Amino acid sequence: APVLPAAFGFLASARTGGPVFATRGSHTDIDTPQGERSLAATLVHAPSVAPDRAVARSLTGAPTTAVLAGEIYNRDELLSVLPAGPAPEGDAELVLRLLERYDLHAFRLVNGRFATVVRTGDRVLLATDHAGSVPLYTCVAPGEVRASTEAKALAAHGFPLADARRVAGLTGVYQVPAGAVMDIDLGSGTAVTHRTWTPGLSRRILPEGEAVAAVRAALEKAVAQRVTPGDTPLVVLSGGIDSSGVAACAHRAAGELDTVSMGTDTSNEFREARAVVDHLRTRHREITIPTTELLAQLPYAVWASESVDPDIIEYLLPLTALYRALDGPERRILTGYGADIPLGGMHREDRLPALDTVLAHDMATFDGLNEMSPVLSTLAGHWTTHPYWDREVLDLLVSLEAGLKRRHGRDKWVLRAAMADALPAETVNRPKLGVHEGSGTTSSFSRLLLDHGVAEDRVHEAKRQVVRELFDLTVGGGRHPSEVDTDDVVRSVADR
Ligand SMILES: N=C(N)NCCC[C@H](NCC(=O)OP(=O)(O)OC[C@H]1O[C@@H](n2cnc3c(N)ncnc32)[C@H](O)[C@@H]1O)C(=O)O
Ligand SMILES: [Mg+2]
Ligand SMILES: [Mg+2]
């Protein structure tokens, strides 16, 4: 529903001397008071949004300009540490007020879904939220610093930056790691990176009672922060405990709930989803996308996510299509995505030792996948947020000892028990089922391959070659997905 962030993404630059995005929306070039020596930036955002709130300026320290894509959820908290009074008019101004107090350490305090770039004097700051849910890339050269929330905008011509990965194929284009802040001196072109968050490695113990309660309270608040007062949110659900947990909380926070479920002509989860829409009495809508169409949208998913990971792509393909086929006006969409990462729910492990090993490195290897990028939905005009990856909910879920994740013969137990009084028993105890499984994405994507020659002891690697190809063409090539024929790229790869 209405009330989206002041901005979805952006392209900025800071020099001593027309961007094309996947994100759909309006563009607004911000003013440049000191012109040449100011921070130039093109903002991409909803046509019904006033970019203002995403831009803030000041003279504190120096001439300072701040651009912020996304939103912050722990506003009251952040506002409580400041000299109360001149409340900022937005998140960008909020960030600026915080930077004046804690400097770059301010980002250690922010709980949100954002990406920002700030310039003060010849100093340039680049930051992401604890999870890096709003991809942020950069080209740093002595005297020139280009920032963008999409690598495709920076894929034309920087110098190597340490503590930052290079974007596949591109050269001189880096990504700002998750939960980090790059301190950049425009003069020398030097960049220092500070991490402002890192998964916890220790585990805490708690009796079922307290554990189930803390997990519920946290989730409820994570959702409360994400739902806008007034309009009814939209929840994309499966009729999994994850998205059902979220639907339950959102329903309470908004008093009403619109839901939507995706399916293909091979399989779907409409029955599991219906069992939830009926319990909660939500306004439901089932969308079925032909497997052929599903696969035909491969280049769009890779173009929006800017990822080259085959498996993640299979997870996003169904979701991406669903966002694109969504009917009606731009919505504020909540999800239950990510819940499995801190729970190892995608591994189906009954052995605590293996469960901890698995859930752990999973937390240490999510950066760079962009699975939770907002572009997956903003390419269609929809804003998405994921409450399970809220910093507070993530911290807690991650910290729980394996015996609370795998317990009583069930996985993700703690969460299942946390929602047992708001969802039907069949739902709470429904076995884990990937979006890419309950729709036949992974299976279908293996025919189109096998149906082109590639045999067994290859298939996975082949998908990896197709996905990498789509990337080079769209992200690193300037080619719109609609110009890349999936079946063509598949053919050129069905070889070796
Ligand atoms: N980096 C890692 N190591 N982890 C990767 C694994 C990530 C994992 N995502 C894959 C996964 O199995 O999805 P899964 O937990 O099934 O699916 C993800 C989320 O997508 C939405 N969703 C799923 N199926 C549908 C459907 N049919 N219609 C509408 N919305 C739907 C739901 O809101 C749900 O909470 C997850 O944790 O969400
Ligand atoms: Mg899940
Ligand atoms: Mg599922």
Residue bearing the CA closest to ligand 1, atom 11: 434
Atom of ligand 1 minimally distant from the CA of 438: 27
Resolution of the model in angstroms: 2.5
Q: Is the CB of residue 267 below 6 angstroms from any atom belonging to ligand 1?
A: no
Q: Is the CB of residue 139 below 6 angstroms from any atom belonging to ligand 1?
A: no
Q: Which residues are annotated as a binding site for Mg(2+)?
A: 242, 340
Spatial separation of the C-alpha atoms in residues 335 and 340, rounded to whole Å: 12
Q: Is the CB of residue 330 below 6 angstroms from any atom belonging to ligand 1?
A: no
Q: Is the CB of residue 335 below 6 angstroms from any atom belonging to ligand 1?
A: yes
435: CA distance to ligand 1 center in Å? 5
Q: Which ligand is nearest to the CA of 337?
A: 1
Active site residue 323: no
Domains and CATH numbers, the chain: 2-199 (3.60.20.10), 200-494 (3.40.50.620)
Contact 42, 177 (CB under 8 A): no
Across 184-211, b (16+ Cβ under 10 Å) vs e yields bbbeebebebeebbebeeeeeebeeeeb
115: CA distance to ligand 2 center in Å? 25
Atom of ligand 1 minimally distant from the CA of 345: 37
Active site residue 432: yes
Residue bearing the CA closest to ligand 1, atom 17: 435
Q: Is the CB of residue 236 below 6 angstroms from any atom belonging to ligand 1?
A: yes
